Each structure stands twice: as C-alpha cells, then as structure tokens.
Paper text:
In addition, we present a structure of solitary FolT from the same organism in the folate-bound state. We determined the crystal structure of folate-bound FolT1 at 3.0 Å resolution. Well-defined non-protein electron density inside the α-helical core was assigned to the folate molecule. The occluded folate-binding site is lined by all six membrane α-helices and is located close to the extracellular side of the membrane (orientation as in Fig. 1a), where it is shielded from the exterior by the L1 loop connecting helices 1 and 2, and the L3 loop between helices 3 and 4. The substrate-binding pocket has a volume of about 1,400 Å3, which leaves a vast amount of space for extensions on the folate molecule such as a polyglutamate tail. The pterin moiety of the folate molecule forms a network of strong interactions with residues from helices 3 and 4, and the connecting loop L3, while the aminobenzoate and glutamate moieties interact with residues from helices 5 and 6, and loop L1. A detailed description of the interactions is provided in the supplement, but it is important to note that loop L1 and loop L3 provide many of the interactions with the folate molecule. In FolT1, L1 and L3 cover the folate-binding pocket and provide multiple interactions with the substrate, whereas they have moved away in the substrate-free state, creating a wide opening. The conformations of loops L1 and L3 in folate-bound FolT1 are incompatible with binding to the ECF module, because they would clash with TMH3 of the membrane domain of EcfT at the position of the conserved P71. Thus, high-affinity binding of folate to FolT and interaction of EcfT with FolT are mutually exclusive.
Author numbering: 13 to 167
The structure:
C-alpha cells in the first residue's frame, strides 16, 4: 500500500522533531507533539496509536531516554497520537476540535500519565510530581493549539 510509505516517513518525522526538546528527567518541552498530531490527523486513532507506540520504540532505540526506557512513556505516545485521532481525523479543520483535542491530551497524557510515570521513576508522591510540572501544562496548551492549527491548515 502507498500509505505505508507515508506512515514510516511521519514516524520518521515524529522521531526527528521529537529530538528538539529542552528539559529534565522530569518535564520536557518539545516539538514531538507536532508529529504525534500528524499521526492522528492523517492515519486515524488505531494506526495513530500504532505509529505513536512505534515511533517511541524507534526514538528510544536510536536516541535513548533520560534515565532509561520506561514502557509507560510508550503508552503515552500511543494515546497522545490516538486522541488527536478521535478528534481531528477526517473532519473539517475547526478551532473547537483543536481546543478540545489539545485539552484532552494535556489532561490525560501529560498531566495524568506522564506525571504518573515521572512520579514513579523518581521516588516522589504523585502530587509532588504534579507540582513541579503543572506550570508547563497550563502554559503550553495554547502554543500547542496554535501550532496545531498551522499544522492542520498547512497540510
Ligand atoms: N520509552 C520511553 N520514552 C520516553 O520518551 C522516555 N522519556 C523519559 C524522560 N522523562 C520524561 C519526563 C517528562 C517528559 C515531559 O514532561 N514531556 C511533556 C510532553 C512533551 C511536551 O509537552 O513538550 C509532558 O508535559 O509530559 C518527557 C520525558 C524517560 N523514559 C522514557 N522512556
């Protein structure tokens, strides 16, 4: 199939942009979301969950993660690309979908899950973790939404 040539390239994209990030073994800030949104826009949730799940393995395998591989961050990258799917897939680019999608991702994946992982990886209690990370998760969503627009428009 043609679209599977595509899937690879966008995994490749997702992996590459993912390497533009600043941060800690606790919160990181980067362009990885850009790729993961593409996966949900173009391929839908299932293939988007697959591609996200996948692109994390690859990115891990090549670049490696601070503090080592954790199978949790994998799940996150899969849900991340799958939620942008349920929202944005085969639909007219709208602002309310962009807000809803980035808001759900940020709550479940970033605020919920990645904190759960970080809390686990470090010795912390969850809210200790949450307190270190919550400023980012309040600020970035608007940047994510704007970027998500230009991405969705551009393609
Ligand atoms: N398999 C695997 N994949 C990974 O990416 C990974 N990353 C780490 C490094 N730990 C972290 C901790 C927090 C964030 C983080 O806070 N990311 C943002 C999303 C990225 C963004 O929004 O720019 C977040 O808010 O959770 C990333 C990596 C450790 N093990 C891993 N293991």
């Amino acid at each position: 199939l043609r679209e599977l040539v595509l899937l690879a390239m966008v995994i490749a994209i997702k992996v590459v942009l993912g390497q533009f990030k600043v941060g800690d073994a606790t919160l990181q800030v980067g362009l990885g979301f850009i790729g993961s949104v593409m996966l949900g826009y173009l391929f839908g949730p299932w293939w988007g969950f697959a591609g996200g799940a996948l692109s994390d393995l690859v990115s891990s395998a090549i670049f490696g993660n601070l503090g080592g591989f954790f199978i949790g961050f994998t799940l996150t990258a899969a849900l991340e690309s799958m939620i942008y799917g349920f929202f944005l897939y085969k639909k007219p680019i709208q602002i309310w979908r962009v807000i809803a999608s980035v808001i759900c991702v940020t709550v479940i994946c970033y605020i919920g899950l990645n904190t759960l992982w970080v809390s686990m990886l470090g010795g912390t209690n969850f809210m200790v973790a949450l307190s270190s990370r919550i400023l980012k998760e309040m600020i970035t969503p608007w940047i994510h939404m704007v970027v998500v627009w230009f991405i969705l428009e551009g393609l």
